[PDB]
Design a protein that fits this description.
Two copies of one chain form a homodimer.
Chain A: E1 4-8, H1 13-18, E2 24-28, E3 45-48, H2 54-57, E4 65-68, H3 78-83, E5 87-89, H4 96-112, H5 114-122, H6 125-129, E6 143-147, H7 151-161, E7 166-170, E8 181-182, H8 186-192, E9 195-198, H9 212-218, E10 223-226, H10 235-244, E11 249-252, H11 263-267, E12 271-273, H12 282-302
Parallel strand pairs in A: 1-2, 1-3, 3-4, 4-5, 6-7, 6-9, 7-8, 9-10, 10-11, 11-12
Helix pairs in contact in A: 4-7, 8-9
The complex binds NADP nicotinamide-adenine-dinucleotide phosphate (2 copies), 2-keto-D-gluconic acid (8YV) (2 copies), chloride ion (4 copies), magnesium ion (4 copies) and sodium ion (2 copies).
Binding site for NADP(+) (chain B): 148, 150-151, 171-172, 204, 226, 252, 275
Binding site for Mg(2+) (chain B): 317
Protein name (chain B): 2-hydroxyacid dehydrogenase
Chain lengths: 319, 318
């Protein structure tokens, strides 16, 4: 009858609310193949946030589609999905402006120490000790390099244009038409700028791209902001750079092994840390939920997904 | 050399540069009781915050008050004008800094970023999972600026890039801009869901953001105050927040700094800052420079750099 969709582990309840429009939902408490039972072998689709282990994906012989919750889909083995003729979809565009907003807020919090200033006030220190100390850093006069200048990178750049800072970017291919300075290497951009915003996907090509050399080039007024994926930053090298004063500060929304954050990173008074919140408003998460479900609905009703990923430009063949 | 009184705390850069032309007289607080007989020849004051009239009037030869800050409501400018005393402020050098902070405060209010960071730092990510989704967002908002001066315009320029509708209220419209003018504050409040306060703290703005304005702002309403605390009816705001009349607030300034009402500290939908909008090293250094350069210009040329509107004065010396 109706296609059966597996939802492994946690997902926004709006996905679960709307799947009954067309589907039966099969739930397992974590993304683990050991929890797959014999009566689940007819599942035809997955809706998932985060990791989809290959053994779990491969437990389903009739699987046609993985609808990833999020624009980043590095938790899905897209190479393996493609090899099996399985379409993978993501949630681009509906979160672009939200994530760009968060990126700017994180940058300002990192530079001006706004969260720290609020803690000073809330702990009664304004009354008892007087003004919060002046922030050594400011956005004024900074030069910002965007590592990534895609949907979200461009949206961040557009915001930054209005703040009166210089904007440069690094990507594998330049985007002609824009009036921003292209750098063909990450390290060369880092040299040239004092503020590096990371907004690339977490792929093999970006793994630990922000390394000791890049951090050294960024320099002693350097501020690193990561709103992409944790894997793109060498977290150990960042902790070392911060400890040595190789750079001035950092703002991070994403980490190597979420929800674990290394103890050393928590120590620094010149670092802002967020628990992967860049898209995490009710409105934007509702829109992401809608796009996951609408991808599944489009696939099963029309054979054409709404937002398939680049690696799987597929159309449904019904078997 | 002219003698300059500096009452209470001020950026040390002011104190460092005064010796370029002046003798400095320091008192520990802005209090007339600390004025001694040998201070009666003072010709200028450099001050941050309040300058009580009894202190200002302890100096028969006073010519100039150089206010640290673009806001100068702590100086009784009417009294200064009556005495032929020029008052200067520090516009422009802090405009972009303050606009930056305003945007950061707005985003922190809407997205709860400081609370999300506390969730992480307190170990709750691990044991309790994701930080709750923020009920609010900037997406789809309509922002009304109360004030569209040096700083208000700079805020509006930033907001243009965030894809929100922009409106403003001032006593006189600024032609040439493509923003919607509202001739009344309450009418703007009706029309918008986000109100950014960036007017001076004058008689005309005292408690302008009152119960009616907050009610018009509405149940999705967010109030951001980066102007002066006096402009918001703080008691009415607490009531509005408590009742859900509005959705949230971000405040850098308060009625009776550094005191913040305990009720405001209770709300999970409020961001509070201890008057930090200009408080970077670079911007405070520029402000300090402008205070001193105003005094130097006055005594050397007879023309201040940035006198306030109420005192368009030129020096008369014998
Ligand atoms: N923190 C959060 O909550 C959050 C939320 C949403 C998204 N994200 C992350 O942000 C990422 C970007 O999203 P998006 O929508 O902007 O994606 P997108 O439109 O595909 O942009 C990706 C950008 O990265 C560049 N890039 C990719 N690989 C590169 C490499 N090896 N070296 C240099 N540049 C490289 C791309 O240009 P080239 O192909 O020319 O190199 C492109 O400019 C997502 O993949 C996700 O991981 C995080
Ligand atoms: N939080 C902080 O750290 C911080 C830092 C800097 C400044 N401030 C505050 O920001 C204020 C604004 O600075 P600014 O440089 O932008 O000043 P500005 O250029 O003089 O602008 C003041 C604006 O407020 C409007 N305004 C004044 N009285 C009004 C009234 N009764 N009703 C409606 N609009 C009114 C003015 O327009 P009309 O005259 O045409 O009405 C003008 O657009 C300062 O006075 C200070 O109190 C706070
Ligand atoms: O869209 C993205 O890629 C994100 O980073 C977040 O919005 C998702 O919640 C996350 O990716 C789920 O893994
Ligand atoms: O410039 C202003 O008006 C300010 O609000 C701050 O930058 C000052 O530090 C403070 O107001 C001095 O009273
Ligand atoms: Cl969610
Ligand atoms: Cl598994
Ligand atoms: Cl200061
Ligand atoms: Cl007094
Ligand atoms: Mg998850
Ligand atoms: Mg590409
Ligand atoms: Mg005016
Ligand atoms: Mg003369
Ligand atoms: Na550099
Ligand atoms: Na309203």
């Amino acid at each position: 009858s109706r296609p059966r969709i597996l939802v492994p582990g946690k997902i926004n309840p709006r996905v679960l609310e709307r799947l009954p429009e067309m589907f039966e939902t099969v739930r397992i408490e974590r993304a683990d193949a050991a929890l797959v039972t014999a009566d689940m072998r007819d599942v035809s689709g997955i809706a998932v946030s985060g990791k989809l282990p290959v053994p779990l994906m491969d437990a389903f012989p009739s699987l046609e589609i993985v609808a990833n919750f999020g624009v980043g889909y590095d938790g899905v083995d897209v190479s393996r999905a493609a090899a099996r003729g399985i379409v993978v979809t993501n949630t681009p565009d509906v979160l672009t402006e939200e994530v760009a907003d968060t990126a700017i807020g994180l940058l300002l919090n990192t530079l001006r120490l706004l969260p720290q200033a609020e803690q000073w006030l809330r702990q009664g220190r304004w009354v008892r000790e007087g003004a919060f100390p002046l922030s050594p850093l400011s956005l004024r006069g900074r030069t910002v390099g965007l590592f990534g200048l895609g949907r979200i990178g461009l949206a961040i750049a557009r915001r930054l244009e209005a703040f009166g800072v210089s904007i440069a970017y690094h990507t594998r291919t330049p985007r002609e038409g824009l009036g921003f300075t292209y750098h063909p290497t990450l390290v060369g951009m880092a040299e040239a700028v004092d503020t590096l915003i990371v907004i690339v996907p977490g792929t093999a090509s970006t793994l630990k791209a922000v390394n000791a050399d890049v951090l050294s080039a960024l320099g002693p007024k350097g501020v690193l902001i990561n709103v992409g994926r944790g894997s793109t930053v060498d977290e150990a090298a960042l902790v070392t750079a911060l400890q040595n004063g190789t750079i001035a500060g950092a703002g991070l929304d994403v980490f190597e092994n979420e929800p674990n954050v290394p103890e050393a990173l928590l120590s620094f008074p010149n670092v802002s840390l967020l628990p992967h919140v860049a898209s995490a408003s009710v409105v934007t998460r509702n829109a992401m939920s809608d796009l996951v479900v609408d991808n599944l609905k489009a696939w099963f009703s029309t054979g054409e997904a709404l937002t398939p990923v680049a690696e799987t430009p597929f159309r449904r063949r019904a078997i």
